[PDB]
Design a protein around this nucleic acid. Structure first.
Ligand SMILES: [Mg+2]
Ligand SMILES: [Mg+2]
Ligand SMILES: [Mg+2]
Ligand SMILES: [Mg+2]
Ligand SMILES: [Mg+2]
Ligand SMILES: [Mg+2]
Ligand SMILES: [Mg+2]
Ligand SMILES: [Mg+2]
Ligand SMILES: [Mg+2]
Ligand SMILES: [Mg+2]
Ligand SMILES: [Mg+2]
Ligand SMILES: [Mg+2]
Ligand SMILES: [Mg+2]
Ligand SMILES: [Mg+2]
Ligand SMILES: [Mg+2]
Ligand SMILES: [Mg+2]
Ligand SMILES: [Mg+2]
Ligand SMILES: [Mg+2]
Ligand SMILES: [Mg+2]
Ligand SMILES: [Mg+2]
Ligand SMILES: [Mg+2]
Ligand SMILES: [Mg+2]
Ligand SMILES: [Mg+2]
Ligand SMILES: [Mg+2]
Ligand SMILES: [Mg+2]
Ligand SMILES: [Mg+2]
Ligand SMILES: [Mg+2]
Ligand SMILES: [Mg+2]
Ligand SMILES: [Mg+2]
Ligand SMILES: [Mg+2]
Ligand SMILES: [Mg+2]
Ligand SMILES: [Mg+2]
Ligand SMILES: [Mg+2]
Ligand SMILES: [Mg+2]
Ligand SMILES: [Mg+2]
Ligand SMILES: [Mg+2]
Ligand SMILES: [Mg+2]
Ligand SMILES: [Mg+2]
Ligand SMILES: [Mg+2]
Ligand SMILES: [Mg+2]
Ligand SMILES: [Mg+2]
Ligand SMILES: [Mg+2]
Ligand SMILES: [Mg+2]
Ligand SMILES: [Mg+2]
Ligand SMILES: [Mg+2]
Ligand SMILES: [Mg+2]
Ligand SMILES: [Mg+2]
Ligand SMILES: [Mg+2]
Ligand SMILES: [Mg+2]
Ligand SMILES: [Mg+2]
Ligand SMILES: [Mg+2]
Ligand SMILES: [Mg+2]
Ligand SMILES: [Mg+2]
Ligand SMILES: [Mg+2]
Ligand SMILES: [Mg+2]
Ligand SMILES: [Mg+2]
Ligand SMILES: [Mg+2]
Ligand SMILES: [Mg+2]
Ligand SMILES: [Mg+2]
Ligand SMILES: [Mg+2]
Ligand SMILES: [Mg+2]
Ligand SMILES: [Mg+2]
Ligand SMILES: [Mg+2]
Ligand SMILES: [Mg+2]
Ligand SMILES: [Mg+2]
Ligand SMILES: [Mg+2]
Ligand SMILES: [Mg+2]
Ligand SMILES: [Mg+2]
Ligand SMILES: [Mg+2]
Ligand SMILES: [Mg+2]
Lengths: 104, 83, 99
RNA sequence: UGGAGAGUUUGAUCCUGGCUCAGGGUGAACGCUGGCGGCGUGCCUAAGACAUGCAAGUCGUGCGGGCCGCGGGGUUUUACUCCGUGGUCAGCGGCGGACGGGUGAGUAACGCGUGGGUGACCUACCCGGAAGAGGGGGACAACCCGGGGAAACUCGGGCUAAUCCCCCAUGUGGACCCGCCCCUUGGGGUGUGUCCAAAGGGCUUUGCCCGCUUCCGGAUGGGCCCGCGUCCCAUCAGCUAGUUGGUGGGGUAAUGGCCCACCAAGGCGACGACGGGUAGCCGGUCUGAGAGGAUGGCCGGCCACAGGGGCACUGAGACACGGGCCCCACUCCUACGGGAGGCAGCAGUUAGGAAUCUUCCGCAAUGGGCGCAAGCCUGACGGAGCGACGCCGCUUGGAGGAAGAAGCCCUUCGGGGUGUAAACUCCUGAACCCGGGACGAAACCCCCGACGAGGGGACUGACGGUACCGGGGUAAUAGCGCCGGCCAACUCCGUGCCAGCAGCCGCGGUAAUACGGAGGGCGCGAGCGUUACCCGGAUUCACUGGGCGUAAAGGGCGUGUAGGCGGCCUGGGGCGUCCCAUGUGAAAG
């Protein structure tokens, strides 16, 4: 079966492509506690239909470009920028960790 | 093509072949598609040839070619007996 | 030294030419057909279009093209040819094309 | 069905804690020793350089020839010329040379492992099914003639056959554009229009055998894509411009920034980007009670590579180990212009190294390529050779034999030990001789039947006169380490903080069970030790399974980001979690 993943659109910044963030809980091999971990998929949105913060199912599919091998299947749950802002702060923090620091 | 033939499996001076179906291009003792029988040419035990004529015939029915002895062994375990 | 992979090498040089020239033929024809379609010369461009389609299916009879290698070059060609007679065309000789 | 601990910090004690030992393992090497057989195994270094030989050819049933023969024809005879036939040589053409064999240099990558996707694809030969092969034309080697080159080789002219190449026809069918239908990514149908087929050979010659063409299906083999998994350094923290996406095109068997033009300004990173280091991955292997740790050597699977770097051509398949082109480094020929090579194929040489084998026999078997077959080729392979390198098996005897030789060693001078050991008596009979002598092999082929099923017959063994059997028959190699404690085994002499030993503790300063010899003893035994390395003991990186007041360990204190964690009651979902069925988990191990 073509793998189907469910995630959150965190990018509209391209044409006919949305970036989906897909989490996955699983117990850790050695230490056992259940760890989150998540990966961004570039997904194909030909209609620029899905918006920033939509929750979408994504489907394994024939290549559309480098990076793009999934197309956006159905809409699951409409808007929610909580997950986005979450992901947004995550990336913003990167500003601090380097050789310098201050007021981000 | 794809062959029915013997693969060597005994030891030095102690030969036992496996009657196997394989792409003719593998090494003789390499990964095969399917074993369908075995063969001790020394007749050391009373059970020294075994085949399974159903699979033997299946493969034939899709034009696996037997070797000049696989066909020989096959025959002897009545693969080709049609009466 | 000296084998008769030696033969094979010289053999392959021959085929290289058979092919080279077959493939050459198509390009210069395909272009011609298409180029005549930009000018909207309907009957004549289809007349060439057909001879092209031939050498393509024909190249394909042997190991010059064979394949969907033909179907591509063939498709690729009828497309550009009909699209280009959307310049008032009316597919005159209606040669290789469907009504 | 599975779990042992000991020695060492103190005058003594408990704890903390490192070090060391007892176990197991090895592609080993080194020392001392060394008798037999079976099966395994054997450059860990220089992916250094390679002499010589051999490693991939085959088909006369696709075709036309050249050279050396022999026979029979046309004529009254010859010269000329026709036909048949033996040997040989290449050429054209077909299939194979992309397998098999070698290596692990590179690679941290969908490379590999694993589970899926392909409506985005290919597949020579092989099997099944449907239909078909009618006209015509052409060229290039061979061969003939002439040149250039020292050579490798090369240029020009002419002749010619084909299952070589091409044009026309036949359209079962198929490809393509547009439209409609179902389907749902490029899947399947359908209607016009266009486009696309073919090869002949052999006969125990009308009738089969081998080929050819197109299409659908199968079998095998592959491409590509995706989820998850896959070492160390954060004393590498930022990275990216084909970069990230879009449209159109190019390319391919097929998706794709794979490539290209134009446009948009994206993409990745603390869940470690980028960089640096190291490394083929796996099945497996060693260890471990396990969880883990370590490894990827034989064998099997995948990958990558073929002196170093690029590149395409031919083809079902290669960017091609024993094909082509170019640049580079190296060797060799050279008439100075120019050529020829590529063992990480089998053997073998040399170099490096502690260290790693025969320039062996055979195609008898199994397997591969071509062939209608006869067969040919096969350093794949089956065997043998070498090396105690490993595992297993086996011998160097067996029973009797003193109050108990001799020698050597102790001693309290009485004795005690080596010691049933020896001698010697009898018995068996490794070695060695003699005779018989294999299994692996029955198919291909041929005959009957129908060229099918079935039956009949013939051929063939490298190993090898080996294995195994029988008769004869000789008492016939033993080493090596250890003996203070850990740790099985104590006595004399010698030496005098010397000579030396030593894994850790420690021994030696004139009475040493610790050094060297001796007698004696302990442990293994065709081996015994050493060194090296891996896991173990080590709960000594602790998930199982540890700690931080003083043993090493709480951040100088706060505020707070991400992140981790989250009171009581009800309902929805069912992501984690649990259960059932099912597919997968090749072989070897
Ligand atoms: Mg031109
Ligand atoms: Mg395309
Ligand atoms: Mg102290
Ligand atoms: Mg003390
Ligand atoms: Mg103590
Ligand atoms: Mg201790
Ligand atoms: Mg143990
Ligand atoms: Mg010696
Ligand atoms: Mg041996
Ligand atoms: Mg090596
Ligand atoms: Mg090697
Ligand atoms: Mg030979
Ligand atoms: Mg005459
Ligand atoms: Mg010939
Ligand atoms: Mg290989
Ligand atoms: Mg990595
Ligand atoms: Mg790296
Ligand atoms: Mg790839
Ligand atoms: Mg598929
Ligand atoms: Mg068929
Ligand atoms: Mg002709
Ligand atoms: Mg002619
Ligand atoms: Mg002639
Ligand atoms: Mg000449
Ligand atoms: Mg000429
Ligand atoms: Mg038709
Ligand atoms: Mg559709
Ligand atoms: Mg259609
Ligand atoms: Mg149609
Ligand atoms: Mg035609
Ligand atoms: Mg005929
Ligand atoms: Mg297939
Ligand atoms: Mg751009
Ligand atoms: Mg594009
Ligand atoms: Mg930027
Ligand atoms: Mg490496
Ligand atoms: Mg443990
Ligand atoms: Mg290996
Ligand atoms: Mg080399
Ligand atoms: Mg090609
Ligand atoms: Mg070679
Ligand atoms: Mg050579
Ligand atoms: Mg040396
Ligand atoms: Mg053979
Ligand atoms: Mg054979
Ligand atoms: Mg005795
Ligand atoms: Mg006797
Ligand atoms: Mg006897
Ligand atoms: Mg034979
Ligand atoms: Mg007959
Ligand atoms: Mg028979
Ligand atoms: Mg004796
Ligand atoms: Mg003791
Ligand atoms: Mg002294
Ligand atoms: Mg040691
Ligand atoms: Mg003394
Ligand atoms: Mg003293
Ligand atoms: Mg002593
Ligand atoms: Mg000692
Ligand atoms: Mg541990
Ligand atoms: Mg502790
Ligand atoms: Mg402290
Ligand atoms: Mg404090
Ligand atoms: Mg402090
Ligand atoms: Mg918080
Ligand atoms: Mg709670
Ligand atoms: Mg929470
Ligand atoms: Mg509930
Ligand atoms: Mg669930
Ligand atoms: Mg298994």
């Amino acid at each position: 079966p073509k793998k189907v993943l469910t995630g959150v659109v965190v990018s509209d910044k391209m044409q006919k492509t949305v970036t989906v963030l897909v989490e996955r809980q699983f117990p850790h091999p050695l230490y056992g506690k259940v760890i989150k971990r998540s990966k961004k998929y570039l997904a194909h949105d030909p209609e620029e239909k899905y918006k920033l913060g939509d929750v979408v199912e994504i489907i394994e599919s024939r290549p559309i470009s480098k990076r793009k091998r999934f197309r956006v299947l159905r809409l699951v749950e409409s808007g929610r920028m909580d997950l986005v802002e979450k992901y947004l702060i995550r990336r913003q923090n990167y500003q601090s960790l380097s050789k310098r620091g201050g007021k981000a | 093509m794809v062959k029915i033939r013997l693969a060597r499996f005994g030891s030095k001076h102690n030969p036992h072949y496996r009657i196997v179906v394989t792409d003719a291009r593998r090494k003789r003792d390499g990964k095969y598609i399917e074993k369908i029988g075995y063969y001790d040419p020394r007749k050391t035990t009373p059970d020294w040839l075994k085949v399974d004529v159903e699979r033997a015939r299946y493969w034939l029915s899709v034009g696996a070619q037997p070797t000049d002895t696989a066909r020989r062994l096959l025959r002897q375990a009545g693969v080709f007996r049609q009466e | 030294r000296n084998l008769s992979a030696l033969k094979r090498h010289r053999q392959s040089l021959k085929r290289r030419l058979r092919n080279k020239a077959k493939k050459s033929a198509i390009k210069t024809l395909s272009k011609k057909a298409v180029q005549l379609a930009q000018e909207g010369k309907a009957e004549e461009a289809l007349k060439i279009m057909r001879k092209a389609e031939s050498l393509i299916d024909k190249a394909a009879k042997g190991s010059t093209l064979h394949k969907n290698a033909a179907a591509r070059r063939k498709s690729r060609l009828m497309r550009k040819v009909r699209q280009l007679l959307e310049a008032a065309g009316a597919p005159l000789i209606g040669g290789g094309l469907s009504a």
